[PDB]
């Protein structure tokens, strides 16, 4: 089996949730049949969105350092529970020697498989501005729909003032309301494009399929780690 490397701490709760889902999604008769998982939860990585919006330091030096620590530590491949950080996935890849399985790309493949051609995106303004999902989803013929500028501020509040601050109730209420707004506008499916959203939203809260990049990457990581 291959050792799964998790480059996290963006934020810590989302990182802990991805790991939990990986264990739950792992089939086995005894513990020794579970794959090795090395998690480097590095919360000191500068906020990804702030940099993209020109209001903070570049997170690449720390992202790369964390990836390198994972390599030295024993990881065979890396998964990163941070959608916004994927805006620099290519920069990280070029600096290291092990593969990084993109949550964005795997999620796009999943959406394509379902047959949806339009998706409502719940993500940080950083992710939206950088075009992470727009660029990747276009490759598979999927169109992205985001909330209005004012509604997007509620999304950012739910993520930052909410989940990242420990106030899950506030995060959930603001993210769920925006999710329903997208559904009213015809969203064929909803993308939990921010790991903090993955933490508080579930299929039972929506009227259309909820595509969660965290579940997708958890499944992919488990399959790869076990099939070789």
Give the three-state DSSP class for 168: helix
**Shortest distance (Å) from residue 62 CB to a second copy:** 10
Cβ at position 65, least distance to a second copy in Å: 10
**CA pair distance 127, 116, nearest whole angstrom:** 21
Q: Which residues bind a second copy (CB under 8 A)?
A: 9-13, 15-17, 19-20, 22-24, 26-47, 69, 72-74, 160, 164-166
Give CA–CA dist 195/209, Å, rounded.
Answer: 17
Cβ distance to a second copy smaller for residue 75 or 192 = 75
CA distances from 193 to 30, 38, 169 (A): 34, 24, 19
Q: Tell me the closest approach of the beta carbon of residue 22 to a second copy, in angstroms.
A: 8
Say how many Å lie between the first and final Cα of the chain, rounded.
Answer: 5
Minimum CB distance to a second copy smaller for 24 or for 115: 24
The encoded tokens of residue 194 equal: 């921010």
Give min distance, CB of 25 to a second copy, in A: 10
225: CB partners within 8 A, 6+ apart: 1, 2, 3, 4, 35, 36, 76, 77
Q: How far is the CB of 89 from a second copy (least distance, A)?
A: 19
In 3D, which of 59, 65, 113, 55 has the Cα closest to residue 86? Answer: 59
> Please, which residue, 82 or 142, has the CB nearer to a second copy?
82
Burial of 113 (0-12, 13-18, 19+ CB in 10 A): exposed
Cβ distance to a second copy smaller for residue 114 or 165: 165
Q: Of 32 and 97, which CB lies nearer to a second copy in the complex structure?
A: 32
User: Which residue do the tokens 């702030």 mark?
Assistant: 50
- Cβ distance to a second copy smaller for residue 37 or 144: 37
Residue 79 CB, shortest distance to a second copy, in Å, is 14
Buried b (16+ CB within 10 A) or exposed e, 26-64: beeeeeeebbebbbbbbeebebbbebbeeeeeebbeebb
């Amino acid at each position: 089996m291959k050792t799964i490397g998790i480059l996290g701490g963006m934020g810590p709760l989302a990182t802990a949730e991805l790991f939990r889902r990986i264990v739950i999604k792992t089939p086995a008769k005894r513990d020794q049949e579970h794959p090795k998982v090395i998690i480097f939860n590095n919360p000191q990585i500068p906020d990804r969105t702030a940099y993209i919006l020109g209001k903070g330091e570049d997170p690449r030096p720390q992202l790369i350092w964390t990836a390198k620590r994972l390599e030295e530590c024993g990881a065979d491949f890396i998964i990163m529970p941070a959608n916004t950080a994927h805006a620099f996935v290519e920069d990280i890849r070029k600096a290291i020697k092990i593969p990084i399985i993109s949550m964005i790309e795997e999620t796009a493949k999943k959406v394509k498989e379902l047959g949806f051609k339009k998706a409502g995106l719940l993500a940080t303004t950083g992710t939206i501005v950088s075009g992470v999902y727009e660029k990747e989803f276009s490759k598979y013929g999927v169109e992205i729909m985001t909330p209005t500028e004012d509604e997007q501020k509620d999304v950012m509040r739910g993520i930052y003032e909410g989940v990242k601050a420990g106030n899950l109730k506030l995060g959930r209420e603001l993210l769920l309301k925006t999710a329903k707004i997208l559904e009213e506008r015809g969203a064929e499916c909803i993308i939990a494009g921010c790991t903090e959203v993955s933490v508080v939203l579930k299929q039972d809260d929506l009227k259309v399929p909820l595509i969660d990049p965290m579940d997708v990457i958890a499944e992919v990581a488990v399959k790869v780690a076990l099939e070789k």
